[PDB]
Design a protein around this ligand. Structure first.
Ligand SMILES: COc1ccc(OCc2ccc(COc3c(Cl)cccc3Cl)cc2)c(Cl)c1
Ligand SMILES: COc1ccc(OCc2ccc(COc3c(Cl)cccc3Cl)cc2)c(Cl)c1
Lengths: 68, 262, 272, 262, 272, 68
């Protein structure tokens, strides 16, 4: 039940282990039945800001005149 | 074009020749409750055309000295035809809205109105007692309320007003008004447009709620650039508010609710 | 939590396309990038928004309460659960209208002799009992309620690493409401003014219950005080409807204000 | 449309909402010297974005009594940022230009400005001595010069002015102004447009020349229909001139040139 | 971190190749080996340079600060983060101009009664809060800043193994500069001498922020003092541009000197 | 996600385990998502000192005359 993800290496050691292998991976295993007990995975996604930045009914191009 | 539109709901139609597009809040169009998100088990009532139509609330007048206006939904529509009837006869109710604000002037007038639709628009009170505003004052109905230029604490201990004291630059809630643009909005700049149109989906942490106990949306109108004309220190232009509920569905029918007033 | 787009090189322009001009009346923000108004070079973008994700923004244990017990009714204390007793976490949560997450509670317990030269006591054990709205609240530091046959309790031994427990999403709605524009009651026509009156913006009188804390050891005449600092961290976070942040000082559980109403300093219009 | 444009050069952008198209002189867009037309053998310098950008020269004011204005290129830009530096550090220099003249008013104003780009715009002097205008007077820089309504001969023999005396209807050179339309131009008629935009390629009988000794283009602005407003005998509207050099390449680097002045 | 080459046997020579002669004016070092100037035998080399790798040279926890707090404003202390408060680690880092690495911080906490026969206190808990440049600095040992809703804090219980945390490469440049030949400001012509003046060799006024340390327990009239010794170890190390090491005593954060300017002893030219 | 490397045995025990098998290997597993939390692998490489010892433009042989 182990989950193996890879790390985003910031500072690199003068090793090939700093660039590949299990040496740039980390392992995770959940010990509790309730999902609330789990830690945060932090592999979180993003989205389009459009719902806030452009909640416009008739879609407009920046090059084209906004007021038409 | 971006400027000419026609909105038809039920037996009511609105036309405009100077629009600046329309905003659909959070990109969500109003919809009915899906079976996967349903909660009350009884068969809902959906008045449809009888309730989902354009209702014109009272016209307010904009002057050089105006600070702003506010309304609460569904509150402002509680006395509107069959929408109000269904609201009071049912324990639970849900609805989206099409808010159409109207304000025409001339090519020699200036001014800009910021029209904001705020989910859970809680306003600040007038006393040192927290959350002291009473039901009757929080729900003015179609006449709504007004913003003030400053905070004035109610000191009458014998007869506290128990009312709101929404200061304009503090957006009536302790936040800076310039940041209110994070909420769905449009601007009625007199040199550009006649109106502002906002389509609001139902927003809440529940699928359906009590319309009498809870107001889902708040409409705030603030003069971003004050009204000015030619050389007439004296200038008044009306601001009419027309709102239409959408996808109305009510649950929990019983005897009618008659809330306490004034 | 990802990458940002590269900057593409952009040369001069002489066209009928004018991205610089717009009309903010529509309610939209102009999505311009540097290459729209100036000549740009190609830049391979390596910066990411990994730390500004909703999760990383809240992934910190914030203090929400400091419960105090004097082991010489103060032999036990009760804290009504809330996030509004402090200001820092509260302000961050209020950037949004609704939220849904799990909670991690860490308890830092400290104690000391009030007297520099008097008294002595053996190591203390604390009991932190959660009293869900409805359960009987302790009247004495040692009455029957402390049997916890159903209420969750945490027994902490002084000196051990801070205690920590996780709580699931416990709301009765599909999300927690940071703002509730309404009342719990509707006053009906005809009833006395005393009737149907409730607080504005308040839901249940007892939303999440409270914590009852006590020292389990038999109290000695020695003067001692203990403090349990409660730290809470939202994990597995989802938030809805952004709002402008609090600009003036908080004045209670509501959006009420009173004191620091003039937050901005003076600065000349033409002063850099 | 023919009326809305955006020009971007380097770190500068110009927008207009009331254009009347743009003119590209002789249908030629500026370009660099080709190897088949090359003359100086040394490697050229091409500042690119540092020199090829929009520089705004001083604003002049149009009144009912104005006769006209004139400028010389590259002269008017000799003190403009890194363009001027490269001009003075090199023996030879070549450049094209994008001239953007700006002039807005209102719907109740009238007037028309003729904007002409003239290759080898030689002007008439003020004395009986031929070709007597001195270097300092012929090269005013960014402030340029003005047209006159009549010829007035300088008679001070002790201290001759040695200046130009450009009579407006004679186009400052002994030709009728109405025929100046054979030169690339645009007209800023207040009831139609805000500006005039002209793209000028490098014109000369050589591929490259001395920018300090020789002015390739001349910009002449003449009120074709005088400025008039409502009933205000008193009316002044500014005319701003923004020019951007294009495809700049210099040859013959040495110590900097410091020309004599006034 | 590897092997050294073997010595190959080398016999006598009588040739026109003269590796012994050179010209150091070129700026190069003569790459001679023993077999170039003497007769050698074959030796199979087994020694390696495993311990002199840049990583192994720095792989040690060095003391960079000793923060002191007197639990009877001294109830809390603030230390501006730096590696120049001590000399040993600083001198090693300065063998290079630039560096890039992660950091491991270990905190050794000690405490004691000032009085041999007076006072008593229960076990202490410490809070080590990191205040990034910009965050509010504590004014009192118990003001709102200690809520740490966003600042990283470490709560240490006296007597527990030394606390330890890791910090990523946090520089705003692509590498840390051990030397900066410049200023943060350029004085412009015309401005008052008070204007545009800044320290030579200084970048930001607040590079990495600081640490705020306090004892969380309520202070007792007893006289107590605690000291937090901060140990830092660079891990995942990369360094650029070697420099000669510091020969004379340090005189501040800069390369300034004043006192021990005559480091070398006397020795006869012809004395072994 | 375990990384298995071999040790460089210095002092050898009178065992065959001191010369072979998993007995001369060591195992590693990363527990943290951030690479900063990782220990140093210490399997670090070396390089040519030439950039410092001989930063000369025109390469020269030691047997051959430096000044030519
Ligand atoms: C929108 O932001 C929110 C929403 C809900 C919150 O509190 C809900 C809540 C409900 C129950 C418990 C009970 O948790 C505990 C238990 Cl079982 C055992 C021991 C100790 C505790 Cl501590 C704790 C918090 C908070 Cl603090 C912020
Ligand atoms: C070239 O050599 C250098 C470069 C940078 C350095 O310091 C950078 C630095 C930045 C932030 C922190 C903050 O670290 C901490 C945190 Cl998050 C939490 C708790 C405690 C600490 Cl301690 C610590 C050090 C040092 Cl000491 C030497």
């Amino acid at each position: 039940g182990a989950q193996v993800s890879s790390q985003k290496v910031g500072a690199h050691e003068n090793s090939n282990r700093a660039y590949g292998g299990s040496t740039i991976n980390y392992t995770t295993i959940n010990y509790y039945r309730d999902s609330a007990s789990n830690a945060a995975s932090k592999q979180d996604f993003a989205q389009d800001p459009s719902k806030f930045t452009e909640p416009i009914k008739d879609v407009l191009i920046k090059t084209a005149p906004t007021l038409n | 074009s971006v400027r000419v539109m026609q909105l038809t709901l039920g037996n009511s139609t609105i036309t405009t020749q100077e629009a600046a597009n329309s905003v659909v809040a959070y990109g969500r169009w109003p919809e009915y409750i899906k079976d996967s998100e349903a909660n009350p088990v009884d068969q809902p009532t959906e008045p449809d055309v009888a309730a989902c139509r354009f209702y014109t609330l009272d016209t307010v007048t904009w002057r050089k000295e105006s600070r702003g206006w506010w309304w609460k939904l569904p509150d402002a529509l509680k006395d509107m035809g069959l929408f109000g009837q269904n609201m009071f006869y049912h324990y639970l109710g849900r609805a989206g809205y099409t808010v159409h604000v109207q304000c025409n002037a001339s090519k020699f007038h200036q001014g800009a109105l910021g029209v904001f639709a705020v989910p859970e628009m809680c306003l600040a009170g007038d006393s040192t007692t927290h959350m002291f505003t009473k039901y009757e004052n929080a729900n003015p109905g179609e006449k709504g309320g007004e913003f003030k230029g400053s905070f004035t604490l109610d000191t009458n201990a014998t007869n506290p007003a128990r009312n709101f004291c929404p200061v304009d630059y503090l957006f009536g809630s302790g936040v800076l008004a310039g940041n209110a643009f994070v909420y769905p909005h449009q601007i009625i700049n007199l040199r550009t447009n006649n109106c502002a149109t906002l389509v609001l989906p139902y927003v809440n942490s529940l699928s359906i709620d009590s319309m009498t106990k809870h107001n889902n949306w708040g409409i705030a109108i603030l003069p971003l650039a004050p009204l000015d004309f030619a050389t007439e220190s004296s200038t008044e232009i009306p601001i009419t508010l027309t709102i239409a509920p959408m996808c109305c569905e009510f649950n929990g029918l019983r005897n009618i609710t008659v809330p306490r007033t004034q | 939590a990802n990458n940002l787009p590269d900057t593409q090189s952009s040369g001069p322009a002489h066209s009928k396309e004018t991205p610089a001009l717009t009309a903010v009346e529509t309610g939209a923000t102009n999505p311009l990038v540097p290459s729209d108004t100036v000549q740009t070079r190609h830049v391979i973008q390596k910066r990411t928004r990994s730390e500004s994700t909703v999760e990383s923004f809240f992934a910190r244990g914030a203090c929400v309460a400091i419960i105090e017990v004097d082991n010489d009714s103060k032999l036990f204390s009760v804290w009504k659960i809330t996030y509004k007793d402090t200001v820092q976490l509260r302000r961050k949560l209020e950037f949004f209208t609704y939220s849904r997450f799990d909670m991690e509670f860490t308890f830092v317990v400290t104690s000391n002799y009030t007297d520099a030269n008097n008294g002595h006591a053996l190591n203390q054990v604390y009991q932190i009992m959660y009293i869900p709205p409805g359960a009987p609240i302790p009247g004495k530091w040692n009455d029957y309620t402390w049997q916890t046959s159903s209420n969750p309790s945490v027994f902490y031994t002084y000196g051990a690493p801070p205690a920590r427990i996780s709580v699931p999403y416990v709301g009765i709605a599909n999300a927690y409401s940071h703002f509730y524009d309404g009342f719990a009651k509707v006053p009906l026509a005809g009833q006395a003014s005393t009737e149907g009156d409730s607080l504005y913006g308040a839901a249940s009188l007892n939303d999440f219950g409270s914590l009852a804390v006590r020292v389990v050891n038999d109290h000695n005449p020695t003067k001692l005080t203990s403090k349990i600092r409660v730290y809470m961290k939202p994990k597995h976070v989802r938030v809805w409807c952004p709002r402008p942040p609090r600009a003036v000082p908080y004045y209670g559980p509501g959006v009420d204000y009173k004191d620091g109403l003039a937050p901005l300093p003076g600065k000349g219009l033409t002063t850099y």
